Amino acid sequence: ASQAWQPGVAMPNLYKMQRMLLEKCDLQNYGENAVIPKGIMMNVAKYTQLCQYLNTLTLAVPYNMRVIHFGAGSDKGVAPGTAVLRQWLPTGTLLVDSDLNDFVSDADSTLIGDCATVHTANKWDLIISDMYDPRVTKENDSKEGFFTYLCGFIKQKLALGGSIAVKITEHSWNADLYKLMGHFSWWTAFVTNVNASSSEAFLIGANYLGKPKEQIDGYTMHANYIFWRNTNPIQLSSYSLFDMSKFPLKLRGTAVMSLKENQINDMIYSLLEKGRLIIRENNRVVV
Amino acid sequence: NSTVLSFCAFAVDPAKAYKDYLASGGQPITNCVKMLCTHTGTGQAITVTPEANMDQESFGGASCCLYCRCHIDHPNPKGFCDLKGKYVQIPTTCANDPVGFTLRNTVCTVCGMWKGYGCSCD
Ligand SMILES: Nc1ncnc2c1ncn2[C@@H]1O[C@H](CSCC[C@H](N)C(=O)O)[C@@H](O)[C@H]1O
Ligand SMILES: [Cl-]
Ligand SMILES: [Cl-]
Ligand SMILES: [Mg+2]
Ligand code: NA
Ligand code: NA
Ligand SMILES: [Zn+2]
Ligand SMILES: [Zn+2]
């Protein structure tokens, strides 16, 4: 299949435009995965397909890129996702990761503890989150916890032009996060081909604008997401994992400028929208 | 990793402890992070990105380091680790025990390959 070759499947605009009622999801998140190649961890495969998908988007890639990775630790005590990010990102990109529990990492810095304790003055070019809480005994409402911190972190600490990829599932999601997706030049819900039988997806926001481009209702969009997953079964595929020749993120040398609010006009928003500009300071990073 | 890590962490000589543990029939440390790669790399031992050739696997460095995995001091002069933040290439025949491989082997200082494996020097 043509779809089988892709690193995964993005939620079609047709489904984003709906106003669906919230239903239960007909998918299970755990299963014996027949597509993961031998000796490869699910999360290496998953993050590899995520990065392959991010390669198709207009990500800003400054010369001195700043990337922060939340929920980077596993119960294995290692950081498979971080290792993939380090493989993907330009050499000497600042990569900081974080998790509630202790783990060993290939990141430049590793912060242990609840994400809410993570403080930094500096802004970031890319935010990746794999945060998830097993914890849904009754209703499926918008979840707070780390999502509340994440929305604040994006609003305060993501550079204009920056991008995000945040893991969600049927039950692990947040209405304000979805709303915030409308503050990006483009957004989608992306399902990796290696984990396609799960309700997991990454909410990807490309090129942050710091203001609404469209009005997203979070409860409605999650219902739209569930409806799409319920009505479009995706067969597991690891096809994309067998050609790694073009994997690393392209070195774009994206301009970084510190501009005042009043300097950010029409032509600047246009550059931001096209993945051609990052707006933030270039001070020393302290996390 | 279930016993092996503590066993070595609470030994006077953690590397010797791992060897003894293996000699007694214990399973090598698991969950070393194997990368997806082209297998058309330089074949050097420790690199900035995955550089496996056709005879090697590439692993995330920190996950293949005994001292990182046991959360103990490195024996290096200060506290520096040669593996963490980098990728280590390991002969496919030896890929079952990446931590053991790095403990038992040494990188040639001229060609940058593993002595007794990829290194062909005089
Ligand atoms: N409130 C919170 N703060 C920080 N980390 C959290 C959190 N809630 C969940 N997490 C983390 O989210 C992770 C889900 S598993 C993440 C897998 C990891 N990305 C990998 O590559 O293997 C767990 O490690 C858990 O510690
Ligand atoms: Cl790619
Ligand atoms: Cl330009
Ligand atoms: Mg565009
Ligand atoms: Na970007
Ligand atoms: Na509503
Ligand atoms: Zn180490
Ligand atoms: Zn040599």
Numbering used by the authors:
A (entry chain A): 1 to 135, 139 to 290
B (entry chain B): 10 to 131
Manuscript excerpt for this entry:
The SARS-CoV RNA cap 2′-O-MTase is a heterodimer comprising SARS-CoV nsp10 and nsp16. Nsp16 is unstable in solution, and nsp10 acts as a scaffold for nsp16, yielding a stable dimer active as an RNA cap-dependent (nucleoside-2′-O)-MTase. The nsp10/nsp16 crystal structure shows that nsp16 adopts a typical fold of the S-adenosylmethionine-dependent methyltransferase family as defined initially for the catechol O-MTase. When bound to nsp10, nsp16 is active as a type-0 RNA cap-dependent 2′-O-MTase, ie., active only when the cap guanine is methylated at its N7 position.
In this paper, we report the crystal structure of the SARS-CoV 2′-O-MTase nsp16 in complex with its activator, the zinc finger protein nsp10, at 2.0 Å resolution, in conjunction with mutagenesis experiments, binding and activity assays. Nsp16 was well defined by its electron density except for two flexible loops (residues 19–35 and 135–137) with high B factors and weak or missing electron density. Electron density corresponding to one molecule of S-adenosylhomocysteine (SAH), the co-product of the methylation reaction, was identified in the putative SAM-binding site. Binding specificity for SAM/SAH is achieved by holding distal SAM/SAH carboxylic and amino groups through five hydrogen bonds (G81, N43, Y47, G71, and D130). The ribose moiety is held by three hydrogen bonds involving Y132, G73, and D99. A peak of electron density presumably corresponding to Mg2+ is localized onto nsp16, distant from the SAH-binding cavity.
